[PDB]
Every structure is written in structure tokens, then in C-alpha cells.
């Protein structure tokens, strides 16, 4: 990649910016520029490419074969009980969380058994997060 | 990629911006520019490409074969009980969450058993999040 | 990559920026520039590439074969009980979290059994986080 | 890579920036520049590449074979009980966390049984974090 970037607040080529109780006074702001940006990306002069697969079987005898590809989950539990047995009793609760198997961002590519692959591949995930907030 | 970017508030080529109790006064803001941006991306001079697959079988004998591709889930549980047995009793609750298997963003590409692939592939996920907020 | 960068607040080519109780006064700000940026990335002069696979079987005898690819999960538990047996009793709670198997960001690429691969591959994850906040 | 960098607050080519109770007064700020940046990255003059695999089997006899690829999890537990048996009793709680198997950022590439690979591969993870905050 080129230029992959995370600005928390503010960004610029230039900024004469100001704020609050500012007496920006009697000013000469000049700005001659000559910004000239060129890009030549993933450029391919190829005269012969091939992606050949060949699967020859003859007089063979094949039993109890299992190709499992990735991320086989199996026989999973999440047992999560709660009880509140009150008697002559005050309860207050607040911001009271029972998170179980939360996801947010789940990106996959070329999750395979096989691949003949040829080229650019990419993954990008700029962000802000906050799971919980209270007062 | 080129130029993949996350601005929290504000962004610009230029910004003479101002705020609040600002006496921006008696000013000369000039700005000569010559911004010249060129892009030449994923450009392909190819004289011969091939993606060949061939599957020859003869006098073979094949039993109990299982190709499972990825993400086989199997036999999963999420048991999540709650009880509130009150007697002569005040309960207050607030912001009281029982999240179970929440997702947000789920992007997939080339989730296969096989692939002969040729070219650019890409994935991008700019964001803000907040699961919970209270007061 | 080129240029992969995380700015907490603010960023620029230039910044004459100011703030609060600022008497920026009687000023001459000039700025001659000649910013000239060139990029020539992932550029490929190839005269012959091949990705050849060949799978010859004859008079063979094959039993109880299992190709598992990665991330096979199996037979997993998460037992998480809670009890609150109150009598003549005040309870206060706040910001009271029972997180179990939370994720945020989950990016995969070429998670395979096999791959003949040819080219650029990339992964990028700029961010801010905060799991919990309270007062 | 080139240029991979983490700025906590603010960044620039130049910054005449100012703050608070500033009397920036009677000033001449000039700035002649000639910033000229060139990049020539992952550039490949190749006249013959090959990625050849060949799998010849004859009159062989194969039993009880198991290729497991990486990250095989198996038979895992997380038993996490809590009890609160109050009688004639005040409880206060705050910011009271029972984190179990939280992740944040999980990036994988070429997690395989095999790979014939040819090229650039990359991974980058600029960030701020804070698990917990309270007062």
C-alpha cells in the first residue's frame, strides 16, 4: 500500500486555523504551492502466465478420506446462569453486562482448502472503539 | 491501495478555519495552488494468460470421501438462564444487558474449497463503534 | 508498504495554528513550496511465470486419511455461574461486567491447507480502543 | 516497508504553532521549500519464475495418516463461578470485572499446512489501548 493513516481529530495540507479568544490581527498570509503527486501501482508487463492444475488417478482404491478445511468448530458450550434470591432486601444495579461471544469486525479472504493465486491482496481496519461507558 | 484514511473530525487541503470568540481582523489571505495528481493503477499488459484445471480418473474405486470446506460449525450450545425471586423486596435495574453472539461487520471473500485466482482483491473497514452508553 | 501512520490529534504539511488567548499580531507569513512526490509500486516486468501442480496416483491403496487444515477447535467449555442470595440486606452494584469471549478485530488471509501464491499481500489495523470507562 | 510511525499528538513538515497566552508579535515568518520525494518499491524484472509441485504415488499402501495444520485447540475449559450470600449486610461494588478470554486484534496470514509463496508480505498494528478506567 501507500498512505494509510489515522487522524484523531484534524488534518491538512495547510492550516492557519485558530480558536477560542484569538485576536489574529493585521496579518498577511500568502501561500505559493506546487504539489505534484504521481502514482503507478500494481502495473504488470507479463508475456506468459499460467496457473495449471492436473489430477490424474488410475487404478487406485481410496477409502475413509476426509479433507477438512480450516476453522472447523465442534462441540462447544457457553453455560452462563445467574440467580437473585432476595428477601427483605434492597437491590440496586447499573451498567450491568453479561457479554457472551460478541464480535465486531470479522474479515476473511482466501480461507480455502487450496488456492493457486496470482496478484495483490489487502486488508485494512482503521477505527475507534469503546465497549462500555457509564457514570 | 493508495490513500486509506480516517479523520476523527475535520480534514482539508487548506483551512483558514476559526472558532468561538475570534476577532480575525484586517487580514490578507492569498493562496496560489497547482495541485496535480495522477494515478495509473492495476494496469495489465498481458500477452497470454491461462487458468487450466484437468481432472482425469480411470478405473479407480473411491469410497467414504468427504471434502468439507472451511467454517464447519457443529453441535454448539449457549445456555443462558436468569432468575429473580423477590419477596418483601425492592429491585432497581438499569442498562442491564445480556448480549449473546452479537456481531457487527462480517465480510468474506474467496471462502472456498478451491480457487484458481488471478487479480487484485481488497478489504476495508473504517469506523466508529460504541457498544453501550449510559448515565 | 509506504507511509503508514497514526496521528493522535492533528497533522499537516504546515500549520500556523493558534489557540486560547492568542494575540497573533502584525504578522507576515509567507510560504513558497514545491512538494513533488512520485510513486512506482509493485511494478512487474515478467516474461514467463507458471504455477504448476500435478497429482498422479497409480495402483495405490489409501485408508483412514484425514487432512485437517488450521484452527480446528474441538470440545470447548465456558461455564460461568453467579448467585446473589440476599436477606435483610442492601446491594449496590455498578459497572459490573462479565465479559466472556469478546473479540474486536479478526482479519485472516490465506488460511488454507495449501497455496501456490504469487504477489503482494498486506494487513493493517490502525485504531483507538477502550474496553470500559466509568465514574 | 518505508515510513511507519506513531505520533501521540501532532505532526508536521513545519509548525509555527502557538498556544494559551501567546503574544506572537511583529513577526516575519518566511519559508522557501523544495521537498522532492521519490519511491520505487517492490519492482521486479523477472525473465522466468516457476512454482512447481508434483505428487507421484505408485503401488503404495497408506493407513491411519493425519495431517493436522496449526492451531488445533482441543478439550479446553474455563470454569468461573461467583457467589454472594449476604444476611443483615451492606454490599457496595464498582468497576467490578470478570473478563474471560477477551481478544482485541487477531490478524493472520499464510496460516497453512503448506505454501509455495513468492512475494512481499506485511503486518502493521498502530494503536492506543486502555482496558479499564474508573474513579
Short mmCIF file of C-alpha atoms in Angstrom, two decimals:
data_model
loop_
_atom_site.label_atom_id
_atom_site.label_comp_id
_atom_site.label_asym_id
_atom_site.label_seq_id
_atom_site.Cartn_x
_atom_site.Cartn_y
_atom_site.Cartn_z
CA UNK A 1 0.00 0.00 0.00
CA UNK A 2 0.75 3.73 0.05
CA UNK A 3 -0.60 6.22 2.59
CA UNK A 4 -2.71 4.50 5.23
CA UNK A 5 -3.26 6.81 8.15
CA UNK A 6 -5.37 7.56 11.18
CA UNK A 7 -6.01 11.15 12.28
CA UNK A 8 -7.58 11.51 15.73
CA UNK A 9 -9.05 14.98 15.07
CA UNK A 10 -7.93 17.09 12.14
CA UNK A 11 -5.61 17.05 9.16
CA UNK A 12 -4.43 19.18 6.26
CA UNK A 13 -2.04 20.23 3.62
CA UNK A 14 -2.01 23.59 5.45
CA UNK A 15 -3.92 25.06 8.37
CA UNK A 16 -3.92 28.66 9.53
CA UNK A 17 -6.62 27.57 11.99
CA UNK A 18 -7.36 29.42 15.24
CA UNK A 19 -9.62 29.06 18.31
CA UNK A 20 -11.24 30.46 21.48
CA UNK A 21 -10.24 34.06 22.42
CA UNK A 22 -7.99 34.74 19.43
CA UNK A 23 -7.18 38.24 18.15
CA UNK A 24 -5.45 37.21 14.94
CA UNK A 25 -4.75 40.79 13.80
CA UNK A 26 -3.16 42.80 10.94
CA UNK A 27 -1.96 39.73 9.07
CA UNK A 28 -0.52 38.76 5.67
CA UNK A 29 -0.84 35.03 4.96
CA UNK A 30 0.44 34.13 1.48
CA UNK A 31 0.98 30.61 0.14
CA UNK A 32 2.51 29.76 -3.25
CA UNK A 33 2.31 25.92 -3.75
CA UNK A 34 3.17 23.36 -6.45
CA UNK A 35 2.08 19.95 -5.08
CA UNK A 36 2.50 17.31 -7.83
CA UNK A 37 1.78 13.70 -6.91
CA UNK A 38 2.15 10.73 -9.29
CA UNK A 39 1.25 7.10 -8.75
CA UNK A 40 2.00 3.96 -10.83
CA UNK A 41 0.73 1.00 -8.88
CA UNK A 42 0.35 -2.76 -9.50
CA UNK A 43 1.49 -2.36 -13.10
CA UNK A 44 2.17 -5.65 -14.89
CA UNK A 45 4.03 -6.23 -18.20
CA UNK A 46 3.64 -10.04 -18.44
CA UNK A 47 4.22 -12.03 -21.68
CA UNK A 48 3.10 -15.51 -20.45
CA UNK A 49 1.47 -16.58 -17.17
CA UNK A 50 -0.19 -19.93 -16.40
CA UNK A 51 -1.99 -21.45 -13.41
CA UNK A 52 -2.08 -25.19 -14.22
CA UNK A 53 -3.59 -27.92 -12.03
CA UNK A 54 -3.78 -31.61 -13.07
CA UNK A 55 -5.24 -34.53 -11.11
CA UNK A 56 -4.56 -37.96 -12.68
CA UNK A 57 -5.91 -41.08 -10.97
CA UNK A 58 -5.52 -44.59 -12.47
CA UNK A 59 -6.48 -47.93 -10.88
CA UNK A 60 -6.31 -46.78 -7.25
CA UNK A 61 -8.51 -47.70 -4.27
CA UNK A 62 -9.35 -44.90 -1.79
CA UNK A 63 -11.34 -45.21 1.48
CA UNK A 64 -12.15 -43.10 4.58
CA UNK A 65 -10.63 -39.86 3.24
CA UNK A 66 -11.63 -36.55 4.89
CA UNK A 67 -10.24 -33.17 3.78
CA UNK A 68 -11.45 -30.66 6.37
CA UNK A 69 -10.52 -27.06 5.52
CA UNK A 70 -9.85 -24.53 8.35
CA UNK A 71 -11.98 -23.19 11.20
CA UNK A 72 -13.80 -26.45 11.95
CA UNK A 73 -15.54 -25.70 15.27
CA UNK A 74 -17.07 -28.69 17.06
CA UNK A 75 -18.95 -29.47 20.31
CA UNK A 76 -18.69 -26.09 22.05
CA UNK A 77 -20.53 -24.82 25.15
CA UNK A 78 -21.20 -21.47 26.90
CA UNK A 79 -23.21 -22.16 30.09
CA UNK A 80 -23.95 -18.86 31.87
CA UNK A 81 -26.54 -18.89 34.72
CA UNK A 82 -27.47 -16.10 37.19
CA UNK A 83 -29.79 -16.08 40.23
CA UNK A 84 -31.00 -13.29 42.55
CA UNK A 85 -32.98 -14.57 45.56
CA UNK A 86 -33.90 -11.50 47.63
CA UNK A 87 -35.97 -11.36 50.84
CA UNK A 88 -36.49 -8.18 52.95
CA UNK A 89 -33.77 -6.77 50.71
CA UNK A 90 -32.96 -3.76 48.51
CA UNK A 91 -31.10 -4.33 45.21
CA UNK A 92 -29.72 -1.55 43.02
CA UNK A 93 -27.93 -2.41 39.76
CA UNK A 94 -26.49 -0.30 36.93
CA UNK A 95 -24.40 -0.78 33.75
CA UNK A 96 -24.61 -4.49 34.43
CA UNK A 97 -23.41 -6.51 31.46
CA UNK A 98 -23.21 -10.22 30.65
CA UNK A 99 -21.43 -10.21 27.31
CA UNK A 100 -21.01 -13.63 25.68
CA UNK A 101 -19.26 -14.11 22.32
CA UNK A 102 -19.62 -10.58 20.98
CA UNK A 103 -17.67 -9.82 17.82
CA UNK A 104 -17.21 -6.56 15.95
CA UNK A 105 -15.19 -6.88 12.78
CA UNK A 106 -14.60 -10.20 11.04
CA UNK A 107 -12.93 -10.03 7.62
CA UNK A 108 -11.64 -13.09 5.74
CA UNK A 109 -10.02 -13.68 2.37
CA UNK A 110 -8.73 -16.86 0.68
CA UNK A 111 -9.93 -19.04 3.52
CA UNK A 112 -9.71 -22.21 1.47
CA UNK A 113 -8.61 -25.77 1.25
CA UNK A 114 -6.42 -24.76 -1.73
CA UNK A 115 -5.63 -21.84 -4.00
CA UNK A 116 -3.46 -21.14 -6.97
CA UNK A 117 -3.31 -17.35 -6.51
CA UNK A 118 -1.73 -14.58 -8.52
CA UNK A 119 -1.87 -10.88 -7.57
CA UNK A 120 -2.30 -8.17 -4.95
CA UNK A 121 -4.33 -8.90 -1.83
CA UNK A 122 -5.04 -6.46 1.04
CA UNK A 123 -6.77 -5.82 4.44
CA UNK A 124 -7.32 -2.57 6.40
CA UNK A 125 -9.26 -1.72 9.58
CA UNK A 126 -8.99 1.88 10.75
CA UNK A 127 -11.25 2.61 13.74
CA UNK A 128 -12.33 3.89 17.12
CA UNK A 129 -13.92 1.59 19.70
CA UNK A 130 -15.43 1.79 23.15
CA UNK A 131 -17.14 -1.30 24.61
CA UNK A 132 -18.75 0.33 27.68
CA UNK A 133 -19.25 3.81 29.12
CA UNK A 134 -21.18 4.94 32.20
CA UNK A 135 -21.34 7.39 35.17
CA UNK B 1 -4.22 0.53 -2.24
CA UNK B 2 -3.49 4.26 -2.17
CA UNK B 3 -4.85 6.73 0.39
CA UNK B 4 -6.96 4.99 3.01
CA UNK B 5 -7.52 7.28 5.95
CA UNK B 6 -9.63 8.00 8.99
CA UNK B 7 -10.28 11.58 10.10
CA UNK B 8 -11.86 11.92 13.55
CA UNK B 9 -13.35 15.38 12.92
CA UNK B 10 -12.23 17.51 10.00
CA UNK B 11 -9.91 17.50 7.02
CA UNK B 12 -8.74 19.65 4.14
CA UNK B 13 -6.35 20.73 1.51
CA UNK B 14 -6.34 24.08 3.36
CA UNK B 15 -8.25 25.52 6.28
CA UNK B 16 -8.27 29.12 7.46
CA UNK B 17 -10.97 27.99 9.91
CA UNK B 18 -11.71 29.83 13.18
CA UNK B 19 -13.97 29.44 16.24
CA UNK B 20 -15.60 30.82 19.42
CA UNK B 21 -14.62 34.41 20.38
CA UNK B 22 -12.37 35.12 17.40
CA UNK B 23 -11.57 38.62 16.14
CA UNK B 24 -9.84 37.63 12.92
CA UNK B 25 -9.14 41.21 11.80
CA UNK B 26 -7.56 43.24 8.95
CA UNK B 27 -6.35 40.19 7.07
CA UNK B 28 -4.90 39.25 3.67
CA UNK B 29 -5.21 35.53 2.93
CA UNK B 30 -3.92 34.66 -0.55
CA UNK B 31 -3.37 31.15 -1.92
CA UNK B 32 -1.83 30.31 -5.30
CA UNK B 33 -2.01 26.48 -5.82
CA UNK B 34 -1.14 23.94 -8.54
CA UNK B 35 -2.22 20.52 -7.19
CA UNK B 36 -1.78 17.89 -9.96
CA UNK B 37 -2.49 14.28 -9.06
CA UNK B 38 -2.10 11.33 -11.46
CA UNK B 39 -3.00 7.69 -10.94
CA UNK B 40 -2.23 4.56 -13.04
CA UNK B 41 -3.49 1.59 -11.11
CA UNK B 42 -3.86 -2.17 -11.75
CA UNK B 43 -2.71 -1.74 -15.35
CA UNK B 44 -2.02 -5.02 -17.17
CA UNK B 45 -0.16 -5.57 -20.47
CA UNK B 46 -0.53 -9.38 -20.74
CA UNK B 47 0.06 -11.35 -23.99
CA UNK B 48 -1.04 -14.85 -22.78
CA UNK B 49 -2.67 -15.94 -19.51
CA UNK B 50 -4.31 -19.30 -18.76
CA UNK B 51 -6.12 -20.85 -15.79
CA UNK B 52 -6.19 -24.58 -16.62
CA UNK B 53 -7.70 -27.33 -14.44
CA UNK B 54 -7.87 -31.01 -15.51
CA UNK B 55 -9.32 -33.96 -13.56
CA UNK B 56 -8.63 -37.37 -15.15
CA UNK B 57 -9.96 -40.51 -13.47
CA UNK B 58 -9.56 -44.01 -14.99
CA UNK B 59 -10.51 -47.36 -13.41
CA UNK B 60 -10.35 -46.24 -9.78
CA UNK B 61 -12.54 -47.18 -6.81
CA UNK B 62 -13.40 -44.40 -4.32
CA UNK B 63 -15.38 -44.73 -1.04
CA UNK B 64 -16.21 -42.65 2.06
CA UNK B 65 -14.70 -39.39 0.75
CA UNK B 66 -15.71 -36.09 2.42
CA UNK B 67 -14.34 -32.70 1.33
CA UNK B 68 -15.55 -30.22 3.93
CA UNK B 69 -14.64 -26.61 3.11
CA UNK B 70 -13.98 -24.09 5.95
CA UNK B 71 -16.12 -22.78 8.81
CA UNK B 72 -17.93 -26.05 9.54
CA UNK B 73 -19.68 -25.32 12.86
CA UNK B 74 -21.19 -28.34 14.63
CA UNK B 75 -23.07 -29.14 17.87
CA UNK B 76 -22.82 -25.77 19.64
CA UNK B 77 -24.68 -24.52 22.74
CA UNK B 78 -25.36 -21.19 24.51
CA UNK B 79 -27.37 -21.90 27.70
CA UNK B 80 -28.13 -18.62 29.50
CA UNK B 81 -30.72 -18.68 32.34
CA UNK B 82 -31.66 -15.91 34.82
CA UNK B 83 -33.98 -15.91 37.86
CA UNK B 84 -35.21 -13.15 40.20
CA UNK B 85 -37.18 -14.45 43.20
CA UNK B 86 -38.12 -11.40 45.29
CA UNK B 87 -40.20 -11.29 48.50
CA UNK B 88 -40.73 -8.12 50.63
CA UNK B 89 -38.01 -6.69 48.40
CA UNK B 90 -37.20 -3.66 46.22
CA UNK B 91 -35.34 -4.20 42.91
CA UNK B 92 -33.97 -1.40 40.74
CA UNK B 93 -32.17 -2.23 37.48
CA UNK B 94 -30.74 -0.11 34.67
CA UNK B 95 -28.65 -0.56 31.48
CA UNK B 96 -28.84 -4.27 32.14
CA UNK B 97 -27.64 -6.27 29.16
CA UNK B 98 -27.42 -9.97 28.33
CA UNK B 99 -25.64 -9.93 24.99
CA UNK B 100 -25.20 -13.34 23.34
CA UNK B 101 -23.44 -13.79 19.98
CA UNK B 102 -23.82 -10.26 18.65
CA UNK B 103 -21.87 -9.47 15.51
CA UNK B 104 -21.42 -6.20 13.66
CA UNK B 105 -19.40 -6.49 10.49
CA UNK B 106 -18.79 -9.80 8.73
CA UNK B 107 -17.12 -9.60 5.31
CA UNK B 108 -15.82 -12.64 3.41
CA UNK B 109 -14.19 -13.20 0.04
CA UNK B 110 -12.88 -16.37 -1.67
CA UNK B 111 -14.08 -18.58 1.16
CA UNK B 112 -13.84 -21.72 -0.92
CA UNK B 113 -12.74 -25.28 -1.16
CA UNK B 114 -10.55 -24.25 -4.13
CA UNK B 115 -9.76 -21.31 -6.38
CA UNK B 116 -7.59 -20.58 -9.34
CA UNK B 117 -7.46 -16.80 -8.85
CA UNK B 118 -5.89 -14.01 -10.85
CA UNK B 119 -6.05 -10.31 -9.87
CA UNK B 120 -6.48 -7.62 -7.24
CA UNK B 121 -8.52 -8.37 -4.12
CA UNK B 122 -9.24 -5.95 -1.25
CA UNK B 123 -10.97 -5.35 2.16
CA UNK B 124 -11.54 -2.11 4.14
CA UNK B 125 -13.49 -1.29 7.32
CA UNK B 126 -13.23 2.31 8.51
CA UNK B 127 -15.49 3.01 11.50
CA UNK B 128 -16.58 4.27 14.89
CA UNK B 129 -18.17 1.94 17.46
CA UNK B 130 -19.68 2.11 20.91
CA UNK B 131 -21.37 -0.99 22.34
CA UNK B 132 -23.00 0.62 25.43
CA UNK B 133 -23.51 4.08 26.88
CA UNK B 134 -25.45 5.19 29.97
CA UNK B 135 -25.62 7.62 32.95
CA UNK C 1 4.22 -0.53 2.24
CA UNK C 2 4.99 3.19 2.26
CA UNK C 3 3.65 5.71 4.79
CA UNK C 4 1.53 4.01 7.44
CA UNK C 5 0.99 6.34 10.35
CA UNK C 6 -1.11 7.12 13.38
CA UNK C 7 -1.73 10.72 14.45
CA UNK C 8 -3.30 11.11 17.90
CA UNK C 9 -4.76 14.57 17.23
CA UNK C 10 -3.63 16.66 14.28
CA UNK C 11 -1.31 16.59 11.30
CA UNK C 12 -0.13 18.70 8.39
CA UNK C 13 2.26 19.72 5.74
CA UNK C 14 2.31 23.10 7.55
CA UNK C 15 0.41 24.59 10.46
CA UNK C 16 0.42 28.20 11.60
CA UNK C 17 -2.28 27.13 14.06
CA UNK C 18 -3.01 29.01 17.31
CA UNK C 19 -5.26 28.68 20.38
CA UNK C 20 -6.87 30.11 23.54
CA UNK C 21 -5.86 33.70 24.46
CA UNK C 22 -3.62 34.36 21.46
CA UNK C 23 -2.79 37.84 20.16
CA UNK C 24 -1.07 36.79 16.96
CA UNK C 25 -0.35 40.36 15.79
CA UNK C 26 1.24 42.34 12.92
CA UNK C 27 2.43 39.26 11.07
CA UNK C 28 3.86 38.26 7.67
CA UNK C 29 3.52 34.53 6.99
CA UNK C 30 4.80 33.61 3.51
CA UNK C 31 5.32 30.08 2.19
CA UNK C 32 6.85 29.19 -1.19
CA UNK C 33 6.63 25.36 -1.67
CA UNK C 34 7.48 22.77 -4.36
CA UNK C 35 6.37 19.38 -2.96
CA UNK C 36 6.79 16.72 -5.70
CA UNK C 37 6.05 13.12 -4.75
CA UNK C 38 6.41 10.14 -7.12
CA UNK C 39 5.49 6.51 -6.55
CA UNK C 40 6.23 3.35 -8.61
CA UNK C 41 4.95 0.41 -6.64
CA UNK C 42 4.55 -3.35 -7.24
CA UNK C 43 5.70 -2.97 -10.85
CA UNK C 44 6.36 -6.28 -12.62
CA UNK C 45 8.21 -6.88 -15.92
CA UNK C 46 7.80 -10.70 -16.14
CA UNK C 47 8.37 -12.71 -19.37
CA UNK C 48 7.25 -16.18 -18.12
CA UNK C 49 5.61 -17.22 -14.83
CA UNK C 50 3.94 -20.56 -14.04
CA UNK C 51 2.13 -22.06 -11.04
CA UNK C 52 2.03 -25.80 -11.83
CA UNK C 53 0.51 -28.51 -9.62
CA UNK C 54 0.30 -32.20 -10.64
CA UNK C 55 -1.17 -35.11 -8.65
CA UNK C 56 -0.50 -38.55 -10.20
CA UNK C 57 -1.86 -41.66 -8.48
CA UNK C 58 -1.49 -45.18 -9.96
CA UNK C 59 -2.46 -48.50 -8.34
CA UNK C 60 -2.28 -47.33 -4.72
CA UNK C 61 -4.48 -48.23 -1.73
CA UNK C 62 -5.31 -45.41 0.73
CA UNK C 63 -7.30 -45.69 4.01
CA UNK C 64 -8.10 -43.56 7.09
CA UNK C 65 -6.56 -40.33 5.73
CA UNK C 66 -7.55 -37.00 7.36
CA UNK C 67 -6.15 -33.64 6.23
CA UNK C 68 -7.34 -31.11 8.81
CA UNK C 69 -6.40 -27.52 7.93
CA UNK C 70 -5.71 -24.97 10.74
CA UNK C 71 -7.84 -23.61 13.59
CA UNK C 72 -9.67 -26.86 14.36
CA UNK C 73 -11.41 -26.07 17.67
CA UNK C 74 -12.95 -29.05 19.49
CA UNK C 75 -14.82 -29.80 22.75
CA UNK C 76 -14.55 -26.42 24.47
CA UNK C 77 -16.39 -25.12 27.56
CA UNK C 78 -17.04 -21.75 29.28
CA UNK C 79 -19.05 -22.41 32.49
CA UNK C 80 -19.77 -19.10 34.25
CA UNK C 81 -22.37 -19.10 37.10
CA UNK C 82 -23.28 -16.29 39.55
CA UNK C 83 -25.59 -16.25 42.59
CA UNK C 84 -26.80 -13.44 44.90
CA UNK C 85 -28.77 -14.69 47.92
CA UNK C 86 -29.68 -11.61 49.97
CA UNK C 87 -31.75 -11.44 53.18
CA UNK C 88 -32.25 -8.24 55.27
CA UNK C 89 -29.53 -6.86 53.02
CA UNK C 90 -28.71 -3.87 50.80
CA UNK C 91 -26.86 -4.46 47.50
CA UNK C 92 -25.46 -1.70 45.29
CA UNK C 93 -23.68 -2.59 42.03
CA UNK C 94 -22.23 -0.51 39.19
CA UNK C 95 -20.15 -1.01 36.01
CA UNK C 96 -20.37 -4.72 36.72
CA UNK C 97 -19.19 -6.76 33.76
CA UNK C 98 -19.00 -10.48 32.97
CA UNK C 99 -17.23 -10.49 29.63
CA UNK C 100 -16.82 -13.92 28.02
CA UNK C 101 -15.07 -14.43 24.67
CA UNK C 102 -15.42 -10.91 23.30
CA UNK C 103 -13.47 -10.18 20.13
CA UNK C 104 -13.00 -6.93 18.24
CA UNK C 105 -10.99 -7.28 15.08
CA UNK C 106 -10.41 -10.61 13.35
CA UNK C 107 -8.74 -10.47 9.94
CA UNK C 108 -7.47 -13.54 8.06
CA UNK C 109 -5.85 -14.15 4.71
CA UNK C 110 -4.57 -17.35 3.03
CA UNK C 111 -5.78 -19.51 5.88
CA UNK C 112 -5.57 -22.69 3.85
CA UNK C 113 -4.49 -26.26 3.65
CA UNK C 114 -2.30 -25.28 0.66
CA UNK C 115 -1.49 -22.38 -1.62
CA UNK C 116 0.67 -21.70 -4.60
CA UNK C 117 0.84 -17.91 -4.16
CA UNK C 118 2.43 -15.16 -6.19
CA UNK C 119 2.30 -11.45 -5.26
CA UNK C 120 1.89 -8.72 -2.66
CA UNK C 121 -0.15 -9.42 0.47
CA UNK C 122 -0.85 -6.96 3.32
CA UNK C 123 -2.57 -6.30 6.72
CA UNK C 124 -3.10 -3.03 8.66
CA UNK C 125 -5.04 -2.16 11.84
CA UNK C 126 -4.75 1.45 12.98
CA UNK C 127 -7.00 2.21 15.97
CA UNK C 128 -8.07 3.52 19.35
CA UNK C 129 -9.67 1.23 21.94
CA UNK C 130 -11.18 1.46 25.39
CA UNK C 131 -12.90 -1.62 26.87
CA UNK C 132 -14.51 0.04 29.94
CA UNK C 133 -14.98 3.53 31.35
CA UNK C 134 -16.91 4.69 34.42
CA UNK C 135 -17.06 7.16 37.38
CA UNK D 1 8.44 -1.07 4.48
CA UNK D 2 9.22 2.65 4.48
CA UNK D 3 7.90 5.19 6.99
CA UNK D 4 5.78 3.52 9.65
CA UNK D 5 5.25 5.87 12.55
CA UNK D 6 3.15 6.67 15.58
CA UNK D 7 2.55 10.28 16.63
CA UNK D 8 0.99 10.70 20.07
CA UNK D 9 -0.46 14.16 19.38
CA UNK D 10 0.68 16.23 16.43
CA UNK D 11 2.99 16.13 13.44
CA UNK D 12 4.17 18.22 10.51
CA UNK D 13 6.57 19.22 7.86
CA UNK D 14 6.63 22.60 9.65
CA UNK D 15 4.74 24.12 12.55
CA UNK D 16 4.77 27.74 13.66
CA UNK D 17 2.06 26.69 16.14
CA UNK D 18 1.35 28.59 19.37
CA UNK D 19 -0.91 28.29 22.45
CA UNK D 20 -2.51 29.74 25.60
CA UNK D 21 -1.48 33.34 26.49
CA UNK D 22 0.76 33.97 23.50
CA UNK D 23 1.60 37.44 22.17
CA UNK D 24 3.31 36.37 18.97
CA UNK D 25 4.05 39.92 17.78
CA UNK D 26 5.64 41.88 14.89
CA UNK D 27 6.82 38.78 13.07
CA UNK D 28 8.24 37.76 9.67
CA UNK D 29 7.89 34.03 9.01
CA UNK D 30 9.16 33.08 5.54
CA UNK D 31 9.66 29.54 4.24
CA UNK D 32 11.19 28.63 0.86
CA UNK D 33 10.96 24.79 0.41
CA UNK D 34 11.79 22.18 -2.26
CA UNK D 35 10.67 18.80 -0.85
CA UNK D 36 11.07 16.12 -3.57
CA UNK D 37 10.32 12.54 -2.60
CA UNK D 38 10.67 9.54 -4.95
CA UNK D 39 9.73 5.92 -4.36
CA UNK D 40 10.45 2.74 -6.40
CA UNK D 41 9.16 -0.18 -4.41
CA UNK D 42 8.75 -3.94 -4.99
CA UNK D 43 9.90 -3.59 -8.59
CA UNK D 44 10.54 -6.91 -10.35
CA UNK D 45 12.39 -7.55 -13.65
CA UNK D 46 11.97 -11.36 -13.85
CA UNK D 47 12.53 -13.40 -17.06
CA UNK D 48 11.39 -16.85 -15.79
CA UNK D 49 9.75 -17.86 -12.49
CA UNK D 50 8.07 -21.19 -11.68
CA UNK D 51 6.26 -22.67 -8.67
CA UNK D 52 6.14 -26.41 -9.43
CA UNK D 53 4.61 -29.10 -7.21
CA UNK D 54 4.39 -32.80 -8.20
CA UNK D 55 2.91 -35.69 -6.20
CA UNK D 56 3.56 -39.15 -7.73
CA UNK D 57 2.19 -42.23 -5.98
CA UNK D 58 2.55 -45.76 -7.44
CA UNK D 59 1.56 -49.08 -5.80
CA UNK D 60 1.75 -47.89 -2.19
CA UNK D 61 -0.45 -48.75 0.81
CA UNK D 62 -1.27 -45.91 3.25
CA UNK D 63 -3.25 -46.16 6.53
CA UNK D 64 -4.04 -44.01 9.60
CA UNK D 65 -2.50 -40.80 8.22
CA UNK D 66 -3.46 -37.46 9.83
CA UNK D 67 -2.06 -34.11 8.68
CA UNK D 68 -3.23 -31.56 11.24
CA UNK D 69 -2.28 -27.97 10.35
CA UNK D 70 -1.58 -25.41 13.14
CA UNK D 71 -3.70 -24.02 15.98
CA UNK D 72 -5.54 -27.26 16.77
CA UNK D 73 -7.27 -26.45 20.08
CA UNK D 74 -8.82 -29.41 21.91
CA UNK D 75 -10.70 -30.13 25.18
CA UNK D 76 -10.41 -26.74 26.88
CA UNK D 77 -12.24 -25.41 29.97
CA UNK D 78 -12.87 -22.04 31.67
CA UNK D 79 -14.89 -22.67 34.88
CA UNK D 80 -15.60 -19.34 36.62
CA UNK D 81 -18.19 -19.32 39.47
CA UNK D 82 -19.09 -16.49 41.90
CA UNK D 83 -21.40 -16.42 44.95
CA UNK D 84 -22.59 -13.59 47.24
CA UNK D 85 -24.57 -14.82 50.27
CA UNK D 86 -25.46 -11.72 52.30
CA UNK D 87 -27.53 -11.52 55.51
CA UNK D 88 -28.02 -8.31 57.59
CA UNK D 89 -25.29 -6.95 55.32
CA UNK D 90 -24.45 -3.97 53.08
CA UNK D 91 -22.61 -4.60 49.79
CA UNK D 92 -21.21 -1.85 47.56
CA UNK D 93 -19.43 -2.77 44.31
CA UNK D 94 -17.98 -0.71 41.45
CA UNK D 95 -15.90 -1.24 38.27
CA UNK D 96 -16.13 -4.95 39.00
CA UNK D 97 -14.96 -7.01 36.05
CA UNK D 98 -14.79 -10.73 35.29
CA UNK D 99 -13.02 -10.77 31.95
CA UNK D 100 -12.63 -14.22 30.36
CA UNK D 101 -10.89 -14.75 27.00
CA UNK D 102 -11.22 -11.24 25.61
CA UNK D 103 -9.27 -10.53 22.45
CA UNK D 104 -8.79 -7.30 20.54
CA UNK D 105 -6.78 -7.67 17.37
CA UNK D 106 -6.21 -11.01 15.67
CA UNK D 107 -4.55 -10.90 12.25
CA UNK D 108 -3.29 -14.00 10.39
CA UNK D 109 -1.68 -14.63 7.04
CA UNK D 110 -0.41 -17.85 5.38
CA UNK D 111 -1.63 -19.99 8.25
CA UNK D 112 -1.43 -23.18 6.23
CA UNK D 113 -0.37 -26.75 6.05
CA UNK D 114 1.82 -25.80 3.06
CA UNK D 115 2.64 -22.91 0.75
CA UNK D 116 4.81 -22.27 -2.23
CA UNK D 117 4.99 -18.47 -1.81
CA UNK D 118 6.58 -15.74 -3.86
CA UNK D 119 6.47 -12.03 -2.95
CA UNK D 120 6.07 -9.28 -0.37
CA UNK D 121 4.04 -9.95 2.77
CA UNK D 122 3.35 -7.47 5.60
CA UNK D 123 1.64 -6.78 9.00
CA UNK D 124 1.11 -3.50 10.92
CA UNK D 125 -0.81 -2.60 14.09
CA UNK D 126 -0.51 1.01 15.22
CA UNK D 127 -2.76 1.80 18.20
CA UNK D 128 -3.82 3.13 21.57
CA UNK D 129 -5.43 0.87 24.18
CA UNK D 130 -6.93 1.12 27.63
CA UNK D 131 -8.66 -1.94 29.13
CA UNK D 132 -10.26 -0.25 32.19
CA UNK D 133 -10.72 3.25 33.58
CA UNK D 134 -12.64 4.44 36.65
CA UNK D 135 -12.77 6.92 39.59
#
